[PDB]
Amino acid sequence: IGTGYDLSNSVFSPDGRNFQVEYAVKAVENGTTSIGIKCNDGVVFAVEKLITSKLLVPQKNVKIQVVDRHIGCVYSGLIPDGRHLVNRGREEAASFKKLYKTPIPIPAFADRLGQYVQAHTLYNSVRPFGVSTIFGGVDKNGAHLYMLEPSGSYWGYKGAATGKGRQSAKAELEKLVDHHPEGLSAREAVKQAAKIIYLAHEDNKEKDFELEISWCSLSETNGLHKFVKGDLLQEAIDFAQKEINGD
Amino acid sequence: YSFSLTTFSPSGKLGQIDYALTAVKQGVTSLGIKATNGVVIATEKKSSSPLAMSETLSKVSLLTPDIGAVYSGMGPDYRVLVDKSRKVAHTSYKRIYGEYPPTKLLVSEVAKIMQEATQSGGVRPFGVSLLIAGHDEFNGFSLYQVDPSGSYFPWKATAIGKGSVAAKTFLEKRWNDELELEDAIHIALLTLKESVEGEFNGDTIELAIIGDENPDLLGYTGIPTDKGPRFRKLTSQEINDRLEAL
Amino acid sequence: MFRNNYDGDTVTFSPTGRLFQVEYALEAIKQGSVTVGLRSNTHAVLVALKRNADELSSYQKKIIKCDEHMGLSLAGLAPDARVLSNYLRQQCNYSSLVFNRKLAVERAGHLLCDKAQKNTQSYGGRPYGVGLLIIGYDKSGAHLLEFQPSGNVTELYGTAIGARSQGAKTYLERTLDTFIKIDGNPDELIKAGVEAISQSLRDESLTVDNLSIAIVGKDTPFTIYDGEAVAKYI
Amino acid sequence: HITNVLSMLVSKLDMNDTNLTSNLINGIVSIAAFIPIQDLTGEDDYISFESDTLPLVQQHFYHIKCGESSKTFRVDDELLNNAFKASTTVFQSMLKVYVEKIFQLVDVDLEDSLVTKINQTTMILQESMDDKIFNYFASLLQRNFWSNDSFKEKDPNYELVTIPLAALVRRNNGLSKELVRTLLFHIKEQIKRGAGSVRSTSEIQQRDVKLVLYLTALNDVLRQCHESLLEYSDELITFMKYLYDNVTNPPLDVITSIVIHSALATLCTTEITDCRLFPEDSKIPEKDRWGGLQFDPRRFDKQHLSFQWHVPSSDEITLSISILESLSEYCINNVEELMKAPRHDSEYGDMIQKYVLVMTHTLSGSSLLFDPDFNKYRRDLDIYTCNYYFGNTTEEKLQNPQYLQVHRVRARIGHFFHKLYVFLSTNFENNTNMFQILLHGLKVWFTDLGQETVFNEDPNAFIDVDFLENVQSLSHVNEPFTRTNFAIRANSLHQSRVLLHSTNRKASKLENLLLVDIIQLATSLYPDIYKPAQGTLVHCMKQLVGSYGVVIN
Amino acid sequence: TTIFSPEGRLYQVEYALESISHAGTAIGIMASDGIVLAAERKVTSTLLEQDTSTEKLYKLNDKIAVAVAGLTADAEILINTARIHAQNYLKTYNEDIPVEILVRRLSDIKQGYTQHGGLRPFGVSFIYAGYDDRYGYQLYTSNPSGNYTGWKAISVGANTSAAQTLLQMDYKDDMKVDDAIELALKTLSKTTDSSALTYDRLEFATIRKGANDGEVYQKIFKPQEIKDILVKTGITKKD
Amino acid sequence: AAGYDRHITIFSPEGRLYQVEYAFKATNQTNINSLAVRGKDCTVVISQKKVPDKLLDPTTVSYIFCISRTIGMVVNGPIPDARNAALRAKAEAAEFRYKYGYDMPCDVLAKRMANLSQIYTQRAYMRPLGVILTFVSVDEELGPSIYKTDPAGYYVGYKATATGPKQQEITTNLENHFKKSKIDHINEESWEKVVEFAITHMIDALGTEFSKNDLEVGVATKDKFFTLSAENIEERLVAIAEQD
Amino acid sequence: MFLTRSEYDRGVSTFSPEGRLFQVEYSLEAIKLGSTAIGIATKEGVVLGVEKRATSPLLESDSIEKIVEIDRHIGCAMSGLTADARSMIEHARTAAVTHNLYYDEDINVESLTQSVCDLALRFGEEERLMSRPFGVALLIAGHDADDGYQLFHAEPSGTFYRYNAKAIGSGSEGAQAELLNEWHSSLTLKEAELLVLKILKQVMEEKLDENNAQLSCITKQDGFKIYDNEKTAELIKELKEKEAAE
């Protein structure tokens, strides 16, 4: 005669699902659009950053976070929850590096990151993280790209998209992986990432934006995660513009 | 801070424990009988699938070499009480007196564990009733029932679970003060033959006795002082041989 | 007539992913008097209007110091603005003792976010009811952070917080190039803030007692002005 | 606006929120009870819901939500009638989603009140359909039934699919032959796969759930076959024997024996076939009938209210007596061959229980053929004229040899329950469940003369008169009802006369022998025999004059 | 949940007092030279082991006994705490525990379970009995509230009111232990819900002095001894 | 909604912990069927692999976990709850091997994990995990073995246990094979025939053929539990296709 | 009358849609229900005064002293006395002495006021936050070398203002209006005494006398002193002739 199952976190609804983890993904569905593209030797991250006033300081308000050194991280939804899950990831990788004297495997950073998020789905004394993360890097097995939910679910991907523009972004990511079955290059992924992001901004045409991009390629950046700027950024902006102005 | 569970209902009843006796009343029946020279405890094994190997699901359990237990109710609640009951026998009594506790001292300690679960915030009472049966040099043979309340009772015979009222009526009708252990085994096998949900044979039925000492089962010779286990769990072949005498 | 089921606890999510208690914690910022924060390349400034409850009553404190290189203003909850400012001063001292730097103000932002997000995630408390403008100067230049109590922050050239602040905010936004260049003449960066805050006074007036000014850039450390110190700035 | 709201309500039905689902189902059945689920479009090839209705709905809603009154809103009667006619073209996709939601509710942990309400809305929808929309829904309710993924949990809501299939068969007798034939093929397959061949008591096993589905679907469909049963009667009797030979699990015996009840019951029961909102696809009210005539004077018209009834045929009673005497002889002879060489085996008891259970469900259903006053023969003004088959006069009843044949069988089953009571009290006097089955057999044998008292109140494939009276009643307004409600009120009237017909009588020596066994069992030392037997004793005292004197003696 | 009713009264204590008002009757009587305890036991079970050594009546040390109305599971927690306190006093002072010190000790624990909201109170009423040199033969009662009182004769549990009236008219200050045997048996036979009193329905005990000047002796009667005081008293369910 | 009865692990008037019954519906959230069987000297686990999105890496989708050298499990339920329970089972085996100086039996790990589930099934502030755990090994004491554990904390041995939303068809076909063959294991001397037998049963039960990337396999012999790659699965699918 | 209830009323540790904490706000409304207390700060002394309710003759005065010494240079007026008022005052006493023995000098009145407000933020004795109220309104008056004669209204919220003059208890509106219409930075101590008596007269309903009114002042030279009934009487006589002199 009532639905009190959605008010609290350690509770299954009649169907056997945590409704607070189902409402925490709604906080992600409101978020900034962001993607990660996985290459034949690396991972590219790209984000459309909405500039709600000119006062927003330039090149110091940043949506791409560098977890450890060989891994990158872009998140969508409640911004405070991504910051908290970004600081814990940095602790996780720093612990593994002091103890094992090697960089953490990306599959292992993902598991430690996916056990911390599931622990907040256990107890009514806490709420789920209202953020989804895309993270990935180069290790001794090469290129890994992961996406992680409010639920604690995570899988590896060829390309991953989150936030408001995710529909249009996923459909373009499917075109990429279909045209480039073997995979796309490092320079082909940055150009195509800019195209996907501009095409996702067609949902919000009046809300002006900045594009922010980052590398992590074994050949272009020696396997370290690094920012994409200058001429390679302008060459990506011009590809995005000439294909969206498709006349 | 408005914190407790199992508070009093206005008619002078504890409520949550009453709901815990409805979980016990839904379990596969178990029963116990005391004889002149031994005791019997018995139950049925209900398979979740016929692919399950019910040599793994023991329901009748050794607490000390002269004390046995069986349950009705929630089996998970019974695996956790049995291992605390075993730890209690060793730590409270064997390691102070160099001999195992009686079947009245171990029943009190099991009941004290179930009482503490009624008088708590944070915890539900147990969903099990336990029959504990045994022998001691000065009390002799004994059988007791313990309920979710932490109330314990000495019984001549008893039953708990679905078939328990028809079992308790058969136990009243058949019990007499001169039974022997082979007689009590026959009465217990007859009582489970009425309560059985599934097939009746030596594989579906659990049956244990506390009887004479068995010096074979001590597994080492040279010390007559040590008489050897009174508690013996009937083999599936013995149960099928007695089920041929039925 | 329009009851909300999902705003009782800080830990509940709305069916649309909102944390209503946290959005209500932002509406507490609109309960304070206006404060304005702005920066050039070399200075950051705070100017704050202070209320009283009666003409006999001493005006409320609005600017707080954490260290020689940074401090804050508070348009929201005063007794809860003492919790965050205590923790920020504790962290400035921890940096000088445990790391021998001084706490760069971006790092100060990350620590306030962490503390506020903890309140936002656990049962048996409330969101912070206060918004902070933090101003500072360090090796990376003149800096201004708007902390919002949902556990978030942003780097900004200027902003206004408190009741009727859309006026002052729109004046900074119409007069931005004016204040971002100013640098070595800090008194015009103060007059830029005093014009901005004057737009939120609806025929209320600045007075020697009603207004407080604070500035922190280059060598000149974090300092506060009151009484005749703010008379030359009326 | 209404068919737009109907599809919005149906698509919003929920498996988690049982309270929202209850309030959506109130709206769906209230829409269904007043509206014909019919396409009104006049072969107007220009009409569409997306091109006429939904534009005007958006304009009216936007006008109303701006702040204007609906009195300011102007539109042509041409656009309004096109938008209304277009509103009626949307019904077949609403029913596709409805059946799909019904199959998702089969697995939910629902309350009995909401399961019953869901059956009421599903049947009120069916009675509101024209033959076009209903044929689509009937072919939609049977395709999903065979091709489901929807019976997974420990204890499924079989009623939510099987009461709808039986309501299809109530409206159209022609559907039954292929549905019953296909069910019994799927039953035979599950018995060959080993369903019902592992013993359990008090629970249906998860290996048996599909067999229970097809058997409960068979029970419900058979209860609505009426005269369509004549066609495949021989096949069903030879299948019933097979079902009693091949499954021996105690929980399945109650279900497999209820097949005979439902088969016999259809043949001799008098009841409403037609509850339709508008009849026949062929009555005089103009297509301007979107409210169910509720506030018109012609709601009461005899040509609107020309109901059609199952009144039993001579061919159906001759089949009923033939099924009865065949399945009772079968069970008597089978238990009598176990009365030689008893065993204490768990099988031996479950076999005895099966045939005794089968002999209780041959007395149910054929219950409408028995007659309380038979023992007086070897005035009487009955004001309530419950519809009997052999006639209301003594003169008529005894001048038909089928009346004597029916009574002969009742007596011969009753004498078998005494022959069984001496067997069970001498060999098995501890064995409670076969005494509980015997006491249920004796309860039915004492109570169900000329009326059905078990299976009277449990959910079935007729619409509920209290539910449709709660939907259509309005204070100080006289009979604000539609044809469906007038139909089930005429069904309730005959049903009352049958249940108001007095069964009080004087014993014939067989009732005394069996009442003395009930008094013995009421005095028995086992709670599980005495508590049932005392309840049976209360009921058997109501049936007999002076019975309290015999009990206290 | 240990909150007051608006009259300044505790709902949980009242509900625990409703529970003990069903819980079988117990009588205690203080003669000039000993104390008698008796309790009536609802044996509706044939297979329950009568000739079990205790249910209603218990020893707390060598000169103190109790009768229980209420939950036996609750009573046994308090009884062990009292036994531990009696021996811890004897260990400290080399002397047997005074009855007032122990009766009120169990009255202080039972009050605590009524104040904190995480604890339900104890559903038990105790009729204590004993001897010490400070007073002599003492009879006390204690109930779920943590109230305790001194008596010359008292009943607890079911049928308290009928029993108090029967005690009041026959009790004399100068009576002997054998007169208190008779009185407690008469009272229970004049109060019982069961048709007549018998040795298994009855728990009995005494706190006499015996023949030897240093003795005080607590015979908790075995069933055969109870059959003798039954046939001597004229209750006499005898062949 | 009946108040706290439905939202915490406490008894209904009936005696039902709604926190446990609802956690058994969570295990079917994957829409995955898994199958396990014992051979003569091995035990095998076959699991349906769902990768609908083109964008996933199938090398990161896995419901099979290596618990130690000799023991492994399949999980039915959400992957966050399957990775939590796998990490416990890894830690419990490691601490047993240290304390008792021998390798943790499958029976002991299933009991230890089932005792942990009884906590969440009694403590009101603890919820039962939404997973079923299906442990397999070749124990030196019980040879090939299968042990299954569930949200209520009830565990029992098995010779062919299986968990999934279509598990009843697989189980009913397994019961009919064990009924005709009458041995309690499949009599193949090498694990390749056991896995092929386990892919013949899941094809026949689920009404669909499988590609090498639409199937999973596990191979528990003495001294090793290990997972097959898609080409080792395709060798078995090729041998099934060579036979029929 | 017409009802005006919201859904945000009665919320504990919760913000309304405006951010309003309604437990601490409804606690701040109790400054109209107490007995009247008034403070007047000046360059010469802080004059504190309270209306006495007439007592039973059996209740001895020291039981209900609503002007109190915290230390020789600090005192509280309360509009109402509770156990929490004595808790605030005895925390203030213990805080003032613990300051003097740790820092070798007398406590600043601002810092004492903040320390009693920190007690209120803790809710007595987890992050100390301003969610629920504690105790009652204090007028804290005192004198220190750094910030001179100071009158603080310490509220149940753990916040305060310094006032030049403040009234609390049932004269608040009419008193504060006459105080703000009349106060000078030129008030002498004598005129502060006649001013507090003129304000008291006007609220009290009764004829003002040395048995219904109480006076005190903090002076730096004399310390804190509660005034003698004979001294308030000669002051009240002086008020009579000052208005008769018009």
Side-chain angles (χ1 to χ4, degrees), chain E residues 3-133 135-237:
Chain E
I3 65 178
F4 289 102
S5 184
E7 309 304 332
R9 176 167 50 76
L10 299 171
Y11 286 113
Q12 287 272 77
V13 178
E14 306 313 319
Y15 303 151
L17 288 165
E18 289 290 352
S19 197
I20 76 161
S21 193
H22 300 82
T25 191
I27 281 62
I29 308 190
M30 186 188 78
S32 56
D33 58 344
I35 304 151
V36 179
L37 291 174
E40 202 270 330
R41 181 177 181 170
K42 78 188 305 286
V43 186
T44 60
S45 304
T46 300
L47 294 172
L48 187 75
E49 183 79 320
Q50 312 313 123
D51 203 25
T52 184
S53 305
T54 54
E55 183 65 13
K56 293 277 185 279
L57 271 60
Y58 301 86
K59 297 175 183 168
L60 302 190
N61 78 355
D62 296 347
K63 302 188 190 85
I64 303 175
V66 287
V68 178
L71 295 171
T72 42
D74 284 5
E76 191 144 50
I77 302 296
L78 284 326
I79 285 162
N80 277 288
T81 305
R83 293 182 183 174
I84 268 67
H85 176 54
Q87 296 304 318
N88 198 46
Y89 184 94
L90 176 57
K91 186 167 58 67
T92 302
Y93 299 108
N94 210 53
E95 289 186 347
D96 192 348
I97 196 169
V99 188
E100 199 197 304
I101 299 185
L102 185 140
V103 299
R104 73 135 118 183
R105 179 60 178 163
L106 284 179
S107 312
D108 184 1
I109 302 293
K110 199 153 50 177
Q111 195 285 347
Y113 273 73
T114 290
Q115 192 143 61
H116 176 281
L119 308 177
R120 64 162 189 86
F122 295 105
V124 301
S125 179
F126 296 100
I127 297 185
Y128 306 93
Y131 176 91
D132 67 66
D133 293 60
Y135 301 94
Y137 288 108
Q138 297 152 79
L139 176 72
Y140 298 96
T141 285
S142 171
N143 63 44
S145 181
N147 291 327
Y148 85 87
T149 41
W151 295 85
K152 306 183 186 183
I154 177 155
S155 183
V156 303
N159 304 347
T160 289
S161 50
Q164 287 301 122
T165 308
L166 283 162
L167 262 45
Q168 197 146 249
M169 56 191 285
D170 288 341
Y171 184 81
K172 303 296 180 182
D173 287 83
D174 66 349
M175 71 174 28
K176 317 311 297 177
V177 204
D178 307 286
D179 309 327
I181 302 290
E182 287 179 2
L183 179 56
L185 297 170
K186 262 89 175 290
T187 302
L188 279 176
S189 77
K190 299 290 266 287
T191 303
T192 167
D193 298 339
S194 73
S195 48
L197 206 64
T198 43
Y199 66 87
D200 62 333
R201 300 193 69 91
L202 179 63
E203 290 247 72
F204 204 91
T206 58
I207 311 189
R208 295 176 64 186
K209 183 178 179 180
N212 45 322
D213 189 38
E215 180 157 308
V216 170
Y217 183 51
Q218 50 167 18
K219 182 184 289 290
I220 300 200
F221 285 50
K222 74 218 305 291
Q224 190 65 23
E225 297 172 306
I226 299 182
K227 286 182 174 181
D228 278 14
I229 55 174
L230 282 170
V231 305
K232 182 178 179 179
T233 295
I235 310 302
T236 313
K237 297 300 92 183

Side-chain angles (χ1 to χ4, degrees), chain B residues 44 46-50 162-163 165-167 169-170 173-174 193-194 196-200 246, chain D residues 197-203 205-207 249 344-346 429-433 525-528:
Chain B
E44 164 188 20
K46 191 187 77 171
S47 53
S48 56
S49 318
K162 300 179 196 293
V165 295
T169 301
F170 186 84
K173 173 184 169 181
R174 282 291 201 129
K193 194 168 185 167
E194 298 304 332
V196 73
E197 298 177 20
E199 297 184 8
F200 195 64
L246 261 293
Chain D
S197 192
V198 175
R199 199 164 180 274
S200 189
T201 306
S202 196
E203 287 191 327
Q205 296 279 279
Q206 294 177 335
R207 59 202 100 183
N249 202 30
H344 301 291
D345 195 355
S346 309
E429 93 286 351
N430 314 299
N431 198 326
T432 69
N433 295 114
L525 74 168
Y526 287 99
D528 296 329

